Design a protein around this ligand. Structure first.
Ligand SMILES: *[C@@H]1O[C@H](CO)[C@@H](O)[C@H](O)[C@H]1NC(C)=O
Ligand SMILES: *[C@@H]1O[C@H](CO)[C@@H](O)[C@H](O)[C@H]1NC(C)=O
Lengths: 49, 28, 50
């Protein structure tokens, strides 16, 4: 309660930094990309056979 | 009942937002 | 009392790699010609072990 405004400002700045970090070309979502990439290579090999 | 047993004291009643005025019983 | 006990857990296992043409055919060129008819089997097995 005595430090409510500091905590509010730190929360807002952390949310903003997450927002820019997702914007500026991140590979942090790469774990969701592999689930797409591993399946497409599985179906390209079936068609090649 | 609000008593000194189940409350604890810290600071002044300026920085807290939403603070009120009420009596506190002292068990003596 | 103070008791000290042991838990034993596996984390990893041995890596390995297989040469598909060397296992199946060896140094033969005639065998290497006939292995091409079966498709892309060696690339898949190497990719999986990798
Ligand atoms: C609660 O919110 C109302 C409306 O925003 C405001 O008038 C009031 O002062 C607030 N009370 C406290 C304790 O913050
Ligand atoms: C609590 O008492 C003080 C004493 O003067 C007064 O200034 C303040 O306005 C009171 N608070 C409320 C919410 O009435």
């Amino acid at each position: 309660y005595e430090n409510q405004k500091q905590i509010a400002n730190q929360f807002n700045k952390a949310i903003s930094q997450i927002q820019e970090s997702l914007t500026t070309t991140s590979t942090a979502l790469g774990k969701l990309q592999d689930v797409v990439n591993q399946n497409a290579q599985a179906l390209n090999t079936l068609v090649k056979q | 009942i609000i008593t000194t047993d189940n409350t604890f004291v810290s600071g002044n009643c300026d920085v807290v937002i939403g603070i009120i005025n009420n009596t506190v019983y002292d068990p003596l | 009392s103070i008791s000290i006990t042991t838990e034993v857990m596996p984390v990893s296992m041995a890596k390995t790699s297989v040469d598909c043409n060397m296992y199946i055919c060896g140094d033969s060129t005639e065998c290497a010609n006939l292995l091409l008819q079966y498709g892309s089997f060696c690339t898949q097995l190497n990719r999986a072990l990798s």
